[PDB]
């Protein structure tokens, strides 16, 4: 309406919602489909679920490599959305028990899962980079609000999925048997709708062309830089003032600078997988903690598992609260939150959330059940962790964009998602080790988060901003 926000983002945000919703609709039923339709092991079902999740987390590499080196965005997004839709077609087509059995179902399900992972890893970074690219580089104030609304749409899709998916798998009769075809068809239709709404804004988007084989040039420049300093028995100036400064006999400065910026941001992100792994220990351990506290609430019996819903919901209350109020208040005075202090204070908030969880666990273990904790008293730690997530993830998206060279805007987003992926891998590997008391586990997680925050703050103090 004459503002600084292009109408085109209206198509992007509405797309991402329709995507996340669909994704969270398909993932939720996934395990059950393995167990009660394909009749797989608990081991096999869990392994396939985790492998699918890891592939979804790691395909952003392929997505960004395509987008920033070839076809640009809006053609990586379009084609990978088509791949996503084909994967959904196979998934739903492989869940109707009328054709084949135990051989066609398995193959179709696995192929659909692979295609879904490929599509997700390549609709994730490219869509965010595209929406950011819709804004002029001078409009960094509106781009932050756009990223806040992007995260808000993601979380709203997650919440609506958690609230609507059981309605689709409850007492349905696809073919003399539970209706898993609908549980995947509805996400498939939502993905198709997301693709349609995205493609309907084609005439409005601000498609910037790719700048060449960015990935190949970056790899070649780094390899030449690391090979040229090898002046073992001789040499006087292998590479001075940086490890990229004498990789300049080729690769003009306009590429050396971009490689430098990418390297700086990657070094900054180095410890983020640890933070993601530590923060992810709140959808499982906190459910176990909630299992040991009263959940009547006096009004409605609240199952511990339902407490998970409090993560997205609180975010929907903090994203507008922060971006519109708290941050504004921080800007009322001289205080300068530089998008890297926001992330550090978010890490600190997560550390405090796990410290509060440890204190609550100690209080639970202090029973002797007159002093039985309600399902409340889990509210403070959820509030703290959700505030940490809001102040970290949105700021990290904006930081990955604003600090990315124009030629590799969707590669820094891929690096962000890959920190998330490595955090997931760390979670997977550490899940097999459990020999500590729950209160000691929470204390250890809080201490580890404090150490991670300290390391990240020290590294971000010496970070050289792109400019």
């Amino acid at each position: 309406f004459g503002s600084s926000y292009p109408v085109s983002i209206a198509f992007i945000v509405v797309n991402e919602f329709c995507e996340r919703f669909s994704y969270y609709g398909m993932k939720a039923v996934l395990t059950l489909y393995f167990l009660y339709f394909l009749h797989w092991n608990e081991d096999t079902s869990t392994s396939v679920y985790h492998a699918f999740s890891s592939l979804c987390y790691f395909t952003p590499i392929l997505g960004a490599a395509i987008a920033d080196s070839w076809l640009g965005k809006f053609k990586t997004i379009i084609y990978l959305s088509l791949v996503y839709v084909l994967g959904h077609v196979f998934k739903s087509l492989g869940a109707i028990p009328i054709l084949g059995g135990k051989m066609l179902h398995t193959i179709l399900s696995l192929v659909g899962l692979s295609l879904i992972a490929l599509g997700t890893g390549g609709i994730k970074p490219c869509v965010a980079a595209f929406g950011g690219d819709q804004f002029e580089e001078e409009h960094a104030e509106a781009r932050t609000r756009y990223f806040s609304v992007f995260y808000l749409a993601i979380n709203a899709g997650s919440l609506i999925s958690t609230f609507i998916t059981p309605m689709l798998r409850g007492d349905v009769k696809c073919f003399g048997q539970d209706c898993y075809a609908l549980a995947f068809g509805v996400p498939g239709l939502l993905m198709v709708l997301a693709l349609v709404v995205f493609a309907m804004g084609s005439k409005m988007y601000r498609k910037p062309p790719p700048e060449g084989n960015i990935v190949a040039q970056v790899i070649k420049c780094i390899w030449f830089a690391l090979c040229n300093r090898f002046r073992n028995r001789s040499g006087d100036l292998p590479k001075r003032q940086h490890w990229l400064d004498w990789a300049a006999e080729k690769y003009p400065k306009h590429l050396i600078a971009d490689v430098k910026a990418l390297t700086r941001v990657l070094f900054l992100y180095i410890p983020l997988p640890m933070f993601w792994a530590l923060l992810d220990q709140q959808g499982s351990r906190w459910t176990l903690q909630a299992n040991k506290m009263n959940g009547d609430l006096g009004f409605f019996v609240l199952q511990p598992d339902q407490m998970q819903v409090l993560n997205p919901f609180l975010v929907l209350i903090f994203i507008p609260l922060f971006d519109l109020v708290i941050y504004r208040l921080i800007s009322k005075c001289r205080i300068n939150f530089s998008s890297l202090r926001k992330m550090a204070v978010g890490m600190i908030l997560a550390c405090l959330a796990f410290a509060v969880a440890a204190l609550v666990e100690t209080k639970i273990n202090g029973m002797i059940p007159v002093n039985k904790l309600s399902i409340a008293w889990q509210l403070p730690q959820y509030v703290l962790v959700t505030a940490a997530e809001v102040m970290f993830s949105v700021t990290g998206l904006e930081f990955s964009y604003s600090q990315a060279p124009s030629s590799m805007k969707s590669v820094l987003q891929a690096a962000w998602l890959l920190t998330v992926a490595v955090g997931n891998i760390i979670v997977l590997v550490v899940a097999q080790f459990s020999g500590l008391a729950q209160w000691a586990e929470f204390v250890l997680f809080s201490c580890l988060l404090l150490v991670v925050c300290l390391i990240f703050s020290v590294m971000a103090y010496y970070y050289v901003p792109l400019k």
Epitope: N41, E42, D43, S45
Partner: nanobody
Framework: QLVESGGGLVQPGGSLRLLCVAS????????MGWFRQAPGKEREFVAS????????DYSDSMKGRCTVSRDNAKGTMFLQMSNLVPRDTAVYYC????????????????????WGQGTQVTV
């Protein structure tokens, strides 16, 4: 390994509780399931319980209703049938399968490698 099943006769419309005792190796490393072989029939899947007990499945019949559940300590797994009808007058086998990655259907005989002895639960 070396699963032993113990049941007995019951009356129509009553509830019976079969027991499967596994001895020799840990009971937290085995996916377990129940099968029945009515005289003249091949074998019918009855119920399944995973190694951890979290995942439990029952055949379409599961006459009236069933409830399978294991106790990894002492290796006792039991099946709780409630509304037994003149059918299901069959020997109930106990099948034990180790933990492993596989695409075999958990509700089939091919999936399970260790079979116990039957128990004639007539009605």
């Amino acid at each position: 390994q070396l699963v032993e099943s113990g049941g007995g006769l019951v009356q129509p419309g009553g509830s019976l509780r079969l027991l499967c005792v596994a001895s020799g190796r840990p009971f937290n490393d085995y996916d377990m399931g129940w099968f029945r072989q009515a005289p003249g029939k091949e074998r019918e899947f009855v119920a399944s319980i995973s190694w951890s007990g979290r995942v439990t499945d029952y055949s379409d019949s599961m006459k009236g209703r069933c409830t399978v559940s294991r106790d990894n300590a002492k290796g006792t797994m039991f099946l709780q049938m409630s509304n037994l009808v003149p059918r299901d007058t069959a020997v109930y086998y106990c099948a034990a399968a180790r933990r492993r990655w596989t695409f075999k259907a958990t509700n089939t005989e091919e999936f399970y490698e260790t079979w116990g002895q039957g128990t004639q639960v007539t009605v």
